[PDB]
Amino acid sequence: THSHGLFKKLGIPGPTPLPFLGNILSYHKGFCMFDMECHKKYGKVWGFYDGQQPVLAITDPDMIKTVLVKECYSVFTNRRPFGPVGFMKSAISIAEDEEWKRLRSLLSPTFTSGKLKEMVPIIAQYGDVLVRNLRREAETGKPVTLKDVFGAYSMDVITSTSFGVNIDSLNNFVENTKKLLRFDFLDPFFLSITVFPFLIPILEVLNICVFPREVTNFLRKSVKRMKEFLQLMIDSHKALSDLELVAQSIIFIFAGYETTSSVLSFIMYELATHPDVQQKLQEEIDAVLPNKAPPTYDTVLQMEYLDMVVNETLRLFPIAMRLERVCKKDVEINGMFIPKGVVVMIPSYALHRDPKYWTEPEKFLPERFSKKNKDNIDPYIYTPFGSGPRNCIGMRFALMNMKLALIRVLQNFSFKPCKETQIPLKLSLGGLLQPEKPVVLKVESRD
Template sequence: MLPLAHLSHTSLPHATGRCCVFIKAEPSPRACLPSAAAGKGTLRAGMDFLNFSTETWTLLVALVTLFVIYLYWPYGAFKKMGVPGPKPVPLFGTMLAYKRGFMNFDLELILVLSCCPRQNFRLNGPLYDAVSIAEDDQWKRIRSVLSPSFTSGRLKEMFDIMKHHSASLISSMKKKADANQPLELKEYFGPYAMDIVTSTAFSVDIDSLNNPSDPFVTNIKKMLKFDLFNPLFLAIAFFPFLGPLFEKMEFSFFPASVTDFFYAALQKIKSSRETSQHKSRVDFLQLMIDSQKQHVPNDLENDKGLSDHEILSQAMIFLFAGYETTSSSLCFLAYNLAVNPEVMEKLQAEIDSTFPNKASAQYQEVMQMEYLDCVVNESLRLYPIASRLERVAKASVEINGLLIPKDMVVMVPTWPLHRDPDIWPEPEAFKPERFSKENKDNIDPYTYMPFGIGPRNCIGMRFALVMMKLAIVEILQKYSFSVCKETEIPLEMDIQGLLAPKRPIKLKLEPRS
């Protein structure tokens, strides 16, 4: 894998060495000495080992040689390409140096390579045809069917549904606020995101805010529980050639019980929708069903309809993406406001002027709020949920004398890119003014990509932004976020899976006078 953050110089930590302690052993009169028979048995076993046939010895040496070559050969790729960097070690490559960090960004390289299709990782199980995983013509066809779900007109139609769930969110938070108790934010923003996704996508109201044990919620959490030390993940990481074998054996990174549950549930919803007489639905699922009805068999020019399995996969990936990314982004946004009260006060002033006397939020006005947009963008800069993007080069390309061969996996590390002091002055500071109208035009689009960039950016980006902005507006109309003794400052981040804090973010809500 080729990181776009390559080195101009390398600094490696010194080894600490090994300290050996020798203990003088005195012979004990009670010590038992091996018998002569035992000695003969050991000698005979050793002789049998040495008396392997020539063929056996040849095979053994060949296997050891191949294993040693496998340990070292893959890590010589960067050296052959002339890419400077830390010296790799067998099995781990340069993974151990990531924690120290090394970067030297080339924006032209990011611009060209981030537009290549995403690599299709193996062992995706039944999600092999989801829009975020599918490739080439299949991806284009699926994306073209889904895109109309996220137009401004569709989002405006969904806004009233979102407001219903934001009202439930505030009602749930009020109980803790009235008791002056800290809130564990994910317990509120997670169900809020889940309820909006299920209701706007499938017209199903699970009310997970009041029913945290709902099967949809528990199975989503199982799906998103990523274990870096999962034996299957480690096997693929260290021995990638085993991928096709595991795929044939139908192994998957996703728990079968979870995927089976969601495919069965979504199939039931789809079947009932097809037999229903009500045609007024405008949700995500209905759009995909309609694409099937408009599909003309054997018409290659208009072959855009989704198969039954493709419909279920898109619905499933929409659930996972909508739940985790939006809820985590809301948690980070609330945290940033709590630790930067002057920013929160300025945002509340804009909210009060846009919706005087706590007037009901409206779609058009929310989306036109300039400072709110700046605040959300700055929070996503500091905490991009997808801390890195990966693409695969579909053709060999040479940039600045560096040849990127076809099929090379290229990584765009958004976390360090968003915090590079050469790009962002005072990168650790929370400064929404970076994204003001006066400054926004000066930002290179390839230095800020919380939702990815290019043709394969996040298709649900606008949907997620509406959810986030609505929740923050309606909360800040009535309350202010504040830190408490349970608030961890600064946050310690978890390195597994999507970006998340190691420990839950806890804040208090204080009623506004």
């Protein structure tokens, strides 16, 4: 337990680590609370230890720009290798160095504006399915669990756009990609792996992994039954393998399900707790789409206030919480020596709520992102989708998918806080950015 002396010899402050555990006991208050308190106590830069792994947090916009953009291909190319992943090591978000660069090139044409434009009529059909299912619980007279309806919509969207299967999940493959697509408190296992990272090779050789070794076997034979986004990988650097075909699919499914449904639930909580914003957004939607006109590609991009609501919600709730890069070699960025093997981390949650760049950070104020004030927002302090060559590849898809769902939802319904609604919203202290109690709101039809 002697890596614990690296930050003191470097002159970098931080919390004093305990033997074996490091600083992981400070995660009791939550990973995000630990980042904000370290930022207030140590200032610009600090370091801590996840067990024996040294992590260096940076808050300077120029230094964040160097890590994520300038020295990406050379120094900060890969993310932190985490617990037993098995064949998921071939996934793009997991691949490293040249194997990632190949997959990034093979999958970048999937998310072009031309491909995204052809997905609008497909995912607009499920927006109508979402509105239909939203009424049978709106006419029910009792509050709605938003994560359930948004979860079924996110799965219906990602299943048809990635492959081509069209299922109504809320009324029902789905049983293997919904229940078998949930995260039943892997927090204790993630903590033990962090404390015992040397046990990872043992779990790998035993073929033990975070995912169940069936869901993949289901998707493995499902993709094999589909032969006669999934098109681009088959039509074809280096040709993609069949097992690597499934790896990228699973990443897109988890990305399309959890991220899209979680942020949509955070948005509706802010619209219900701020009705004047909800009305102003419905007025912009009604003015751009008169008489409940169906949303289109060019239409969604015209709604300026809709973009401000999504941006402000992504400020308060950056579902990735952190950006991380592994230091491949000894470097000196912006006047600071970074030794090899240190996980450089950018605390997005803490930076999005820093009282240095934001007026009243705890307030939900869409006016920060208006055409006037948006110029004063540093793109390396507000990083909801990351930045640089390894940023979110599905940023435009996620923005388009969420906005299409928000428009169709707000065209027909209004959302008010129910008696069961937790106000203020408290965040879970686990490894995922999600509310403590599930978001429930009263839904009322507008017509």
